[PDB]
Amino acid sequence: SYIDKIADLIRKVAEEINSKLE
Amino acid sequence: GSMSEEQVAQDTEEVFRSYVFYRHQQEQEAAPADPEMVTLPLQPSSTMGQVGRQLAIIGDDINRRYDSEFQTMLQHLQPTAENAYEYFTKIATSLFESGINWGRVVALLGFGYRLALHVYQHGLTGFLGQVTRFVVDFMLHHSIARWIAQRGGWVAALNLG
């Protein structure tokens, strides 16, 4: 459950990185 | 054919280790650096060293905005050498549950950085070599190294625009 919260935050960061790279 | 997954696994070690070093340096006027961070697989001027450096630079503003939340979440999780493989594996699996994109691949490097830094700063354990293997092996085993290879390797991350 807490693992899931951390992964959810990393997924948010990932979309910001993806947008910057694109 | 494409470069091999084995080649991408080697390249990933270089990208990650360079990334970690250059990321720590850019955050140092905000945590002790694990001395192992200054040991790289190859000279930092190599192509993969440059890719790691550029990825650290690109993420700086993003990573600064999330520092407080990640620091709190990792303090709560309390990663150590004894639980880091479990936590890394579960988090990385969830990160990629919906598919692969470059942002997720690069975010995995960032998570590896934060995990290694926490285990050192707070757990008093140098764990960078181990986290390096976690990152490389995860990518190898979940088709990410193949996906990277088929797009021309890690240099592709810097050439999407």
JSON list of C-alpha atoms in Angstrom, two decimals, chain A residues 1 3 5 9 13 16 20-22:
[
{"chain": "A", "resi": 1, "resn": "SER", "atom": "CA", "xyz": [0.00, 0.00, 0.00]},
{"chain": "A", "resi": 3, "resn": "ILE", "atom": "CA", "xyz": [4.90, 0.95, -1.83]},
{"chain": "A", "resi": 5, "resn": "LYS", "atom": "CA", "xyz": [2.06, 5.52, -2.95]},
{"chain": "A", "resi": 9, "resn": "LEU", "atom": "CA", "xyz": [4.76, 9.54, -7.08]},
{"chain": "A", "resi": 13, "resn": "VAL", "atom": "CA", "xyz": [7.79, 12.38, -11.91]},
{"chain": "A", "resi": 16, "resn": "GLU", "atom": "CA", "xyz": [7.15, 15.28, -16.10]},
{"chain": "A", "resi": 20, "resn": "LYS", "atom": "CA", "xyz": [10.63, 17.58, -20.77]},
{"chain": "A", "resi": 21, "resn": "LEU", "atom": "CA", "xyz": [12.48, 15.05, -22.92]},
{"chain": "A", "resi": 22, "resn": "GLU", "atom": "CA", "xyz": [9.86, 15.27, -25.70]}
]
